[PDB]
């Protein structure tokens, strides 16, 4: 069940990494485009 939850959160990260609020610029001049997904992705991949 824990690896199932890990798969689920990985897929959720995969789908959310394109919406223009968490991984695409929804702000042309303000400060989010966190690359932390990468880390999260790595956190999953390993």
């Amino acid at each position: 069940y824990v690896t199932g939850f890990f798969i689920a959160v990985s897929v959720i990260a995969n789908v959310v990494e394109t919406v223009p609020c968490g991984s695409s610029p929804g702000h042309i001049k303000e400060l989010r485009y966190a690359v932390a997904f990468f880390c999260l992705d790595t956190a999953c991949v390993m």
Partner: protein, 51 residues
């Protein structure tokens, strides 16, 4: 059959807190805008730079 799920929840929240900690740890970003206007043509003849 529920306490085992509780142990699963605690181990997963430990993992999630590890993920959040590394998320706040590894990318130590700093923008440091320092938004000051670039030197223009008239600045050399502005009274401020008049040595």
């Amino acid at each position: 059959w529920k306490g085992i799920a509780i142990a699963l929840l605690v181990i997963l929240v430990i993992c999630s807190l590890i993920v959040t900690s590394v998320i706040l740890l590894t990318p130590a970003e700093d923008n440091s805008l320092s938004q000051k206007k670039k030197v223009t043509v008239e600045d050399l003849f502005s009274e401020d730079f008049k040595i």
